[PDB]
Write a protein that binds this ligand. Structure first.
Ligand SMILES: *CC[C@H]1/C(=C/c2[nH]c(/C=C3N=C(/C=C4\NC(=O)C(CC)=C4C)C(C)=C\3CCC(=O)O)c(CCC(=O)O)c2C)NC(=O)[C@@H]1C
Ligand SMILES: *CC[C@H]1/C(=C/c2[nH]c(/C=C3N=C(/C=C4\NC(=O)C(CC)=C4C)C(C)=C\3CCC(=O)O)c(CCC(=O)O)c2C)NC(=O)[C@@H]1C
Ligand SMILES: C=CC1=C(C)[C@@H](Cc2[nH]c(/C=C3N=C(/C=C4\NC(=O)[C@H](C)[C@H]4CC)C(C)=C\3CCC(=O)O)c(CCC(=O)O)c2C)NC1=O
Ligand SMILES: C=CC1=C(C)[C@@H](Cc2[nH]c(/C=C3N=C(/C=C4\NC(=O)[C@H](C)[C@H]4CC)C(C)=C\3CCC(=O)O)c(CCC(=O)O)c2C)NC1=O
Ligand SMILES: C=CC1=C(C)[C@@H](Cc2[nH]c(/C=C3N=C(/C=C4\NC(=O)[C@H](C)[C@H]4CC)C(C)=C\3CCC(=O)O)c(CCC(=O)O)c2C)NC1=O
Ligand SMILES: C=CC1=C(C)[C@@H](Cc2[nH]c(/C=C3N=C(/C=C4\NC(=O)[C@H](C)[C@H]4CC)C(C)=C\3CCC(=O)O)c(CCC(=O)O)c2C)NC1=O
Ligand SMILES: C=CC1=C(C)[C@@H](Cc2[nH]c(/C=C3N=C(/C=C4\NC(=O)[C@H](C)[C@H]4CC)C(C)=C\3CCC(=O)O)c(CCC(=O)O)c2C)NC1=O
Ligand SMILES: C=CC1=C(C)[C@@H](Cc2[nH]c(/C=C3N=C(/C=C4\NC(=O)[C@H](C)[C@H]4CC)C(C)=C\3CCC(=O)O)c(CCC(=O)O)c2C)NC1=O
Ligand SMILES: C=CC1=C(C)[C@@H](Cc2[nH]c(/C=C3N=C(/C=C4\NC(=O)[C@H](C)[C@H]4CC)C(C)=C\3CCC(=O)O)c(CCC(=O)O)c2C)NC1=O
Ligand SMILES: C=CC1=C(C)[C@@H](Cc2[nH]c(/C=C3N=C(/C=C4\NC(=O)[C@H](C)[C@H]4CC)C(C)=C\3CCC(=O)O)c(CCC(=O)O)c2C)NC1=O
Ligand SMILES: C=CC1=C(C)[C@@H](Cc2[nH]c(/C=C3N=C(/C=C4\NC(=O)[C@H](C)[C@H]4CC)C(C)=C\3CCC(=O)O)c(CCC(=O)O)c2C)NC1=O
Ligand SMILES: C=CC1=C(C)[C@@H](Cc2[nH]c(/C=C3N=C(/C=C4\NC(=O)[C@H](C)[C@H]4CC)C(C)=C\3CCC(=O)O)c(CCC(=O)O)c2C)NC1=O
Ligand SMILES: C=CC1=C(C)[C@@H](Cc2[nH]c(/C=C3N=C(/C=C4\NC(=O)[C@H](C)[C@H]4CC)C(C)=C\3CCC(=O)O)c(CCC(=O)O)c2C)NC1=O
Ligand SMILES: C=CC1=C(C)[C@@H](Cc2[nH]c(/C=C3N=C(/C=C4\NC(=O)[C@H](C)[C@H]4CC)C(C)=C\3CCC(=O)O)c(CCC(=O)O)c2C)NC1=O
Lengths: 164, 324, 40, 172, 13, 177, 177, 164, 177
């Protein structure tokens, strides 16, 4: 998993040397920013079904053509799996808010996603539009704190730039 | 850890997590005069890959002493550095001068190319060059064929790829990879299949037959078996290990047939009793109850769970189970 | 002939497929064995 | 196969040295619980069929694919094999709980179970979910009075849950 | 598992 | 690697005699039926992506424990790897149908695939279901009995090719069984 | 490779449950105790060479058959390799103490170390004694009970870290045992 | 130079990816611990000739045999170069207190030092004994602050473990 | 590879002088301004794909001879390679902005890029136009003057970072000029 600890022990293992002062200095900042990212992750965990419901209809509101026959959102089985995949992506974002890095995103949602979405005829723009809608409905004092919103929108922009 | 779930991945806890992390790509054509630790990383990574985690003393590391110096300004990382250090005495002493030729060949495939030889023609294309032209064209044949520049960037260190799909190999070669590469704490002197004098794949690589994958650090990881013939034409001797065949009538009598490999057998603990038998022990002949550890079985399907109980109540440890 | 076959020598220029490579690797391949006879 | 008393002796022969007094009052305390530990294993072996059937019923009301036609829990032969695989792990967890050490659990239950389930195509994660549902019911059933003297048993139910998690991570 | 040449010859004759 | 022509060569080299007369009936019938063989490999090759995607989707929609959390086709990485494994096999079966002999399928695809899936923890029996779905698609595409798409062929009979590709597919399913 | 934070991720991904509320107590206590953890890994790292040399010298001075002619630590090559063998294990235990999880110790150090020492003829018992001496040095260096050198720490209690590093050290012994 | 920034940009360059949140999270700890290590480095810079003079004396006092003929400390030219090399090592420690990592030590004093000290018959134990004496004469409130002393003694132990 | 902290080390190692007093003003101002720098890096990293695609589309829509038949961005292979060529330069300029020193940009991106584009036949001056468009996007994204997207920042002044990234971009454009 790409995180703060793993990068520096992997670098020290590649160099074959003991943990120096720079490695521990990198963990002090993890201690600092965990006060914001953990209470971002907790607020995402406590209210996730509202956000997954709210961002799911923005996809079909922007792209109403998916419910036509021949498309990828015809019957209820496709829309249910659409909501399930959006919930999967929100869970991976909650995981990356906890681990401190983009590890769980890069390995459980991003790597290999392009071949699946091209093969199974899933348009990536509508997998993107839900994440884009989720980012813009984030006010600074209401939904979370100030740094928690920065920490949340950074992972949202990472997922958006990965799928686009 | 072990498994395939709980990480959503299989290849790392197959013993490959250190090899899934490093690249060591050497981003610049020559040395920065002034600066000598971003290459010491590269040179030591090269030493751990090319010598295959064999350990080089400072006395033996100072025998190169010019190659590395020539590498710092006027050689490539991949070609012409790993090429020149395969020609040295420190490589030849532990990879060519104690093994036979096909063994010195299939060790060079792992060190230089990062995979295993596929079949007999991979062996014959490389031993022909040795018998015509000597050791140096033999070692350069690993570099100046088509594969090496196709696979590897000119400044990257060679990496392990014998497990990978996109190296167009046979799938028996996927499983010959883990005969030779067992985790990250193994050199080739450290392999039980190769004592720096044996051939790791001798029957199994020529005949392309596949060999069941025991993950390292597992519970019955310590399994090791010989090879002996079984017929009268080759003057073989029956009874050593079970065949990987399931040939005749009991292959379906008692269902689907399997091949279980059991590694730890010893005299204390046979009876239904959680302890030793007290007495003189052994037998009038003076042999153990199991005269060999590392015994294999060929077993049915309705017969599988009583065999499981008979293994584990007598101190045995199951190394592997593969269906036939 | 002269052997069973007649493959081209690896000491010849343009044997390395200079495409989809890094910049330290592209320049080392497009000037591999032609480095000698401009010094000449 | 070791118990918790044989553990310290097997590490004492290795150094070739007598048990010092700190190991001895570590062991007399472990004797001095004693009755609590057997109250725990008594509660699990009194209700074993209920634990197993309720955990399997919750597993299939949760995952209906195993009993779907084509599932790993399809037919009777497979369903019967699944019913008492769980009862095997419950039996060996109770053995390890009465021993005070997970040596019988690793020897003859978890040794080679993973490639056993791999060679059959059995999904090991669902086995782990079944182990977790047996664990929850066992720790729920363990801390009721039911006509026992009032006291704390927390260090024992933590060890009982640890045996279940050791079984659950080793299968998958 | 299939010999197409012998099958073609047998279907011809 | 041997085709239909090389197979009689290796069969008669064990005999140590020239091959003519008796052994030429199968080769002349193989030549005379070659347009149908090319006409069938083209029909399989033109519909490859729909076949692989439909086979993997059918295998998932019959057994939904694969996309279950902790299943073998759970994440995107495993699903892409299954689609790749799917049709890697379709590619080699197409090679064997073009060559008229399954020797290329043995040497490069099935030699050691049995325990590779074992070491990976791949369920070896849902793969059999995907292989059988691909087989059922291949016979319908060869015999022009596909309901979703009809192609253009000269009229005639080529069920020998359908039985040959069905004979390749159950071999590719039984090698991993 | 997983740390303490990634361990709850993999535990709750088998759940398909969000992490929040219940699962956050251990992570917030891990964060609140992080200065002691860095303060302990620094104390182990600063005394590494004396620890390795003292452990190997203690293992030899308890069992003098290792430097006996024909012993496993007889020549200079074997003695240097044993000092390296000990130093690598100390490095990986320090990694596991810094990460708060022993998963990095399993994957890169202990996976196959059992039969590597068997194929080499390395004695199993001696290495356990060296590991236990290194463990006894590590707990005294963490808890500032070292008799040869006293360090500077803020006052407080960190025997949880001493129990965690003792829990890492016996784990290594068990794998090679 | 081995530092906090260089490790993470080298890791991102080896992976070929943009700086993620873990990289910036590692720099927040540099921002945190620079308040201690810089005022350690400044106090070392302002009073270095007192510490070097003191350090040199300790080595001779421990090893009085170096002033005998045939040894490496015979005349004043050897003792002056001894004080110069001790001042070099203290300057590199001041540099590592500034850069945040062990870069200037590992490349200007440590790499290659063993061949020089073996070839020129310089005993490494006396190059170590001065650094060992410097570490033990560090009191917590008098010489610097509390975390500055930790930051100073960590680099001193790094140099000692490198030369021993 | 040197950052802002290592640059004073190499400058004072030519002096054989200790760093302290005079040389610490720039480092303490670099530390005190570090939150704006991290913030600047984050704002550039969050909008990378739109920046690269917009820069290459602007370079094409100013000079339509690149997509002309026989132009340098004609086929799909050349267009993908140009998008990659732009993305790599943006990655290295982001590295140099994070480190506070352009030494990493010199060593791994610009060392030999001049004649690499010459040997490829790449027009070295449309690349300058793409670099200048990326520079104009970077300064507007740093100073929050982007018309298509506004971000959230604490109020204050950071035009020093905008001049530093403009100072990196014209260097990256003049190395290939
Ligand atoms: C036309 C004869 C060809 C031939 C035969 C041959 N076979 C062997 C040896 C063995 N054959 C088997 C085969 C089977 N065992 C089974 O249970 C089944 C049922 C599925 C089969 C097909 C076995 C086990 C042996 C070894 C035991 C033995 O025969 O003593 C031998 C030589 C015997 C030996 O190897 O010592 C021959 C000669 N070989 C040819 O040359 C013919 C082509
Ligand atoms: C909740 C049920 C889960 C499940 C069970 C399951 N198991 C099998 C098959 C076997 N299980 C074993 C296991 C053991 N044998 C032993 O001796 C011991 C003691 C340590 C254990 C744990 C064996 C040998 C078999 C094969 C023999 C057989 O059962 O006929 C089966 C299917 C039977 C088959 O594969 O034909 C099931 C369904 N699988 C699930 O889906 C549940 C998660
Ligand atoms: C752990 C990480 C993880 C993920 C991120 C997801 C990723 C993912 N999503 C889908 C699958 C899907 N994603 C969608 C979604 C859409 N299609 C549309 O018509 C709209 C564009 C949009 C609605 C939001 C649909 C319809 C499927 C099912 C595709 C299909 O079965 O045809 C699949 C195929 C398997 C399946 O779900 O049945 C996978 C692997 N799954 C994971 O396991
Ligand atoms: C792909 C295209 C391709 C080629 C055309 C050749 C080109 C070529 N020829 C030689 C090498 C040579 N070529 C010749 C040939 C000749 N010298 C003469 O005096 C005659 C005029 C002529 C023969 C008719 C000789 C004699 C050498 C060897 C020179 C030497 O040994 O010093 C070498 C050096 C490597 C070597 O062979 O040792 C190369 C690259 N090789 C290739 O790969
Ligand atoms: C056949 C096996 C067998 C046994 C297990 C015991 C059962 C048993 N347990 C206790 C005695 C006890 N049993 C418990 C146990 C509990 N109290 C609770 O509130 C929890 C629900 C539960 C913990 C799991 C405790 C805590 C004591 C002792 C009271 C105390 O220590 O204060 C006693 C009283 C005598 C004594 O205190 O030693 C007996 C007879 N006897 C047997 O013959
Ligand atoms: C040179 C490249 C080449 C191709 C692209 C294909 C194209 C192709 N197909 C056929 C010709 C044919 N293809 C078929 C095959 C079939 N017809 C059916 O009705 C079934 C659906 C299917 C078999 C199951 C048949 C039956 C013929 C008629 C001639 C024959 O029987 O050989 C012919 C010969 C007659 C003609 O010119 O039309 C050609 C060139 N074959 C080739 O040789
Ligand atoms: C030359 C022939 C050739 C093949 C046949 C494949 C065989 C093959 N498949 C996989 C690897 C795989 N193969 C599958 C496929 C499946 N798992 C399932 O649950 C389904 C039944 C099925 C898809 C239909 C999956 C999911 C993986 C990845 C396993 C993992 O990531 O842990 C690997 C390991 C390397 C890798 O891909 O990462 C190999 C060698 N590769 C080859 O080179
Ligand atoms: C619940 C999940 C589920 C699915 C995903 C589909 C998958 C599916 N398709 C077919 C069956 C088939 N699938 C194809 C393939 C195709 N047909 C076309 O029109 C396209 C060109 C091409 C890609 C879609 C063909 C050609 C057949 C058989 C004949 C026909 O339908 O014309 C079969 C039957 C295979 C068999 O007989 O065993 C199944 C299971 N059905 C399901 O029940
Ligand atoms: C940023 C890099 C970094 C380091 C270099 C170390 C340095 C360090 N240690 C402690 C602080 C501490 N370290 C310890 C640990 C111990 N004290 C003892 O008496 C025992 C011997 C030992 C544990 C067994 C304790 C108990 C504290 C007090 C604060 C706390 O309990 O967290 C603190 C916080 C308070 C302070 O500033 O002094 C710091 C920064 N920790 C870091 O975070
Ligand atoms: C006959 C051979 C022989 C030896 C070589 C030594 C080796 C040795 N040292 C210690 C025990 C120890 N060893 C160290 C390590 C050190 N202590 C320091 O002062 C240095 C800084 C550092 C390197 C020397 C520490 C810190 C302890 C325990 C506490 C202490 O002594 O302060 C132990 C006890 C380990 C245990 O409890 O099992 C042994 C056997 N003793 C022997 O009997
Ligand atoms: C920038 C990094 C840097 C360093 C760390 C030093 C390292 C260093 N020290 C010495 C050199 C030395 N170091 C010593 C010191 C001692 N010998 C003794 O008798 C005592 C053991 C001890 C006194 C403290 C002496 C005497 C020399 C000179 C050796 C000689 O010329 O014979 C030399 C040889 C060149 C010279 O100084 O003349 C070098 C490169 N120099 C550097 O440039
Ligand atoms: C630890 C990781 C980390 C981040 C994710 C970012 C996030 C971040 N930005 C700022 C804080 C700031 N960021 C800016 C920068 C700007 N403001 C503007 O109006 C301009 C548009 C732009 C510069 C051109 C300014 C001016 C401050 C105020 C504090 C300061 O001036 O340093 C702060 C400190 C104050 C606060 O907590 O809000 C933090 C943590 N910085 C970090 O250190
Ligand atoms: C580490 C730093 C680093 C880089 C900067 C790039 C530099 C670079 N670019 C290209 C290769 C290229 N670069 C371009 C880019 C362009 N051509 C144009 O007309 C536009 C002006 C511009 C896009 C905006 C194109 C089109 C090619 C491919 C040329 C070709 O295919 O013939 C190549 C040859 C290898 C290849 O990609 O095939 C290299 C080394 N690569 C690196 O490794
Ligand atoms: C004919 C072809 C043609 C184009 C493709 C566009 C391309 C384009 N965009 C901008 C200019 C810009 N481009 C961006 C980038 C973005 N703005 C956003 O709202 C997104 C988030 C992001 C991707 C689109 C920004 C942020 C600016 C400047 C400020 C702003 O617009 O807010 C400029 C001016 C650069 C300069 O000043 O030199 C050009 C040429 N314009 C053209 O004339």
């Amino acid at each position: 998993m790409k995180s703060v600890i793993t990068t520096v022990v992997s670098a020290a293992d590649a160099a074959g040397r003991f943990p120096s002062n720079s490695d521990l200095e990198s963990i002090q900042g993890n201690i600092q920013r965990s006060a914001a990212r953990l209470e971002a992750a907790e607020k995402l965990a406590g209210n996730h079904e509202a956000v997954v419901k709210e961002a799911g209809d923005a996809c079909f509101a922007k792209y109403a053509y998916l419910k036509n026959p021949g498309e990828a959102g015809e019957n209820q089985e496709k829309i249910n799996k659409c909501y399930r995949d959006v919930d999967h992506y929100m869970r991976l974002v909650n995981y990356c808010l906890v681990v401190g890095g983009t590890g769980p995103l890069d390995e459980w949602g991003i790597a290999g996603a392009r071949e699946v979405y091209r093969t199974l005829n899933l348009p990536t723009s509508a997998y993107v539009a839900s994440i884009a809608y989720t980012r813009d409905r984030l006010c600074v004092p209401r939904d979370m704190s100030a740094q928690a919103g920065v920490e949340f929108s950074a992972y949202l922009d990472y997922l958006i730039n990965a799928l686009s | 850890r072990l498994g395939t779930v709980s990480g959503n991945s299989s290849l790392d806890k197959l013993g490959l997590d250190k090899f899934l992390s490093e690249s060591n790509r050497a981003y610049t054509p020559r040395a920065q005069p002034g600066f000598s630790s971003e290459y010491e990383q590269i040179i030591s990574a090269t030493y751990k890959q090319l010598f295959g985690n064999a350990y080089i003393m400072d006395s033996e590391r100072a025998e190169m002493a010019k190659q590395e110096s020539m590498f710092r300004d006027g050689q490539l990382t991949l070609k012409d550095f790993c090429r020149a250090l395969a020609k040295t005495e420190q490589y030849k002493k532990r990879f060519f001068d104690s093994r036979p030729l096909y063994g010195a060949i299939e060790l060079n495939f792992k060190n230089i190319l990062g995979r295993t030889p596929d079949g007999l023609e991979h062996y014959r294309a490389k031993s022909a060059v040795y018998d015509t032209k000597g050791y140096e064209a033999f070692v350069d044949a690993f570099f100046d064929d088509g594969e090496y520049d196709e696979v590897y960037d000119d400044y990257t260190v060679p990496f392990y790829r014998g497990y990978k799909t996109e190296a167009n190999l046979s799938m028996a070669a996927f499983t010959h990879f883990f005969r030779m590469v067992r985790g990250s704490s193994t050199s080739d002197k450290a392999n039980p299949n190769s004592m720096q004098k044996d051939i790791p794949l001798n029957y199994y690589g020529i005949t392309k037959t596949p060999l069941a994958v025991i993950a390292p650090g597992a519970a019955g990881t310590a399994y090791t078996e010989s090879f002996s013939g079984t017929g009268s034409w080759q003057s073989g001797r029956a009874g050593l290990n079970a065949a990987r065949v399931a040939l005749g009538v009991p292959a379906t009598a008692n269902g689907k047939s399997f091949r279980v490999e059991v590694t730890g057998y010893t005299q204390p603990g046979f009876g239904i009793t959680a302890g030793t038998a007290v007495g003189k022990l052994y037998k009038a002949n003076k042999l153990s109850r199991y005269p060999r550890s590392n015994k294999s079985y060929v077993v049915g399907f309705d017969e599988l769970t009583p065999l499981y109980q008979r293994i584990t109540k007598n101190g045995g440890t199951i190394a592997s189970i593969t269906p036939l | 002939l002269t052997g069973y076959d007649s493959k081209s020598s690896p000491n010849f220029p343009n044997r390395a497929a200079t495409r989809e490579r890094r910049t330290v690797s592209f320049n080392a391949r497009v000037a591999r064995n032609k480095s000698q006879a401009k010094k000449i | 196969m070791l118990d918790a008393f044989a553990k310290v002796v097997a590490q004492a022969d290795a150094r070739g040295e007598f048990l010092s007094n700190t190991q001895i009052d570590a062991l007399s305390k472990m004797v001095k619980e004693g009755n609590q530990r057997l109250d725990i294993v008594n509660k699990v072996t009194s209700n074993a069929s209920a634990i197993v059937t309720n955990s399997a019923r919750a597993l299939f009301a949760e995952q209906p694919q195993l009993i779907q036609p084509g599932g790993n829990a399809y037919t009777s032969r497979r369903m019967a094999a699944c019913l008492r695989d769980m009862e095997i792990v419950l039996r060996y967890v109770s053995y390890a709980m009465i021993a005070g050490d997970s040596s019988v659990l690793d020897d003859r239950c978890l040794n080679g179970l993973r490639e056993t389930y791999q060679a059959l195509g059995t999904p090991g994660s669902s086995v782990a979910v079944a182990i977790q549902k047996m664990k929850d019911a066992s720790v729920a059933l363990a801390n009721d009075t039911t006509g026992t003297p009032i006291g704390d048993c927390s260090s024992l139910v933590a060890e009982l849950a640890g045996y279940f998690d050791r079984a659950a991570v080793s299968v998958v | 598992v299939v010999l197409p040449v012998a099958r073609a010859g047998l279907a011809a004759t | 690697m041997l085709d239909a022509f090389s197979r009689v060569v290796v069969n008669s080299d064990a005999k140590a005699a020239y091959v003519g007369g008796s052994d030429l009936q199968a080769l002349k019938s193989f030549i005379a039926d070659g347009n149908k063989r090319l006409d069938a490999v083209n029909s399989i090759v033109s519909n490859a992506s729909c076949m692989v995607s439909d086979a993997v989707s059918g295998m998932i929609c019959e057994n939904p424990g694969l996309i279950s959390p902790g299943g073998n086709c759970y994440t995107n990485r495993r699903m892409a790897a299954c689609l790749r494994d799917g049709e890697i096999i379709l590619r080699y079966v197409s090679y064997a149908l073009l060559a008229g002999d399954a020797s290329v399928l043995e040497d490069r695809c099935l030699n050691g695939l049995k325990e590779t899936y074992i070491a990976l923890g791949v369920p070896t029996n849902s793969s059999i279901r995907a292989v059988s779905i691909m087989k059922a698609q291949a016979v319908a595409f060869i015999t022009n009995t596909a309901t979703e798409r009809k192609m253009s062929f000269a009229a005639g009979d080529c069920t020998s090719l359908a039985s040959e590709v069905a004979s390749y597919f159950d071999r590719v399913g039984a090698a991993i069984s």
